[PDB]
Ligand binder design. Structure first.
Ligand SMILES: [Mn+2]
Ligand SMILES: [Mn+2]
Lengths: 177, 177
DNA sequence: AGGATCCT
DNA sequence: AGGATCCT
């Protein structure tokens, strides 16, 4: 649906969106803070050409998940909604007379490092990491580390801390595969 | 994405499409036969208003699944593709200056009665039927009846024959729930 | 209930 | 590998 973007064009779009995201809640437009917007996906991995732009939005309250992506607003930018729910929302945005795919995802604060790790990818890397943890009866996803469907609380805050606690070598996003 | 259709408008669209569906295969446009096109979903259940139109296409060869929906063609009608693969293809068609959702699905000959049953719905009915079979260690889907992930070949040809063999009362599509 | 396509 | 949204 969306056209190809260069990495620089993608970064320009992310920079534009950082101050312009909001959601409608009880008849009020609530602005989303730049600090709670994280560029993820292939843009974070510095791929030269992008099929879409991926943003992770950190939502401060569980009760707001109902309202954020389903009532997403982008100041001054026209867009259509391809698919949308509380956790994923795919938009086709109009930018400089062309149409591009913007993927929006949400995470709660407690999920943040797991979500950054997940949404950064790439898929081949996630599969190898998850297969290794699966052998030790763990399940890793964008929400947490689980054993036997029960959350395994880890004493970590950042993505780096998570990767170290999971027992893997840290790699900059561009070198993950 | 698509507008609401009346049942009669839906039927008009199905009638139009019956002679106009084809797919591109090795540089040739292969016409799909009307006899292999079955109206399913809420249109088959005679719902007064439709959110979309559902067609089941019966594909004569397994090897053609690669080619049919991914290269679907509709003579004289403009459309865009929302999502598409070998088994489901959702199109937004232009009809009399309005946009409507056309859902296309494929089944092989051996799957036909199971596919008709599945795609006719409604969801509430499928769930109750499938839950009852699940208690007897069976799994029913659009492809067949399974026990322990193994196909259970049934001596049936039609949807009516299938429903009787599965041990349920036959109901016209409009009365299934 | 069960599966398809699409997201990383 | 694992999950979201959408299809019946
Ligand atoms: Mn991406
Ligand atoms: Mn339908």
């Amino acid at each position: 649906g969306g056209g190809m973007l260069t990495l620089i064009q993608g970064k320009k779009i992310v920079n534009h969106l950082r101050s312009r995201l909001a959601f409608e809640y009880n008849g009020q437009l609530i602005k989303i803070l730049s600090k709670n917007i994280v560029a993820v996906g292939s843009l974070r991995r510095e791929e030269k050409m992008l099929n879409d732009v991926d943003l992770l939005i950190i939502v401060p309250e569980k009760k707001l998940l109902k309202h954020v992506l389903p009532n997403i607003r982008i100041k001054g930018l026209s867009f259509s909604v391809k698919v949308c729910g509380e956790r994923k929302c795919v938009l086709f945005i109009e930018w400089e007379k062309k149409t591009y795919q913007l993927d929006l995802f949400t995470a709660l604060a407690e999920e943040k490092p797991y979500a950054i790790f997940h949404f950064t990818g790439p898929v081949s890397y996630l599969i190898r990491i998850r297969a290794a943890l699966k052998k030790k009866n763990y399940k890793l996803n964008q929400y947490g580390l689980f054993k036997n469907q029960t959350l395994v609380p880890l004493k970590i805050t950042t993505e780096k801390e998570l990767i170290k606690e999971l027992g893997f070598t840290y790699r900059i996003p561009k070198k993950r595969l």
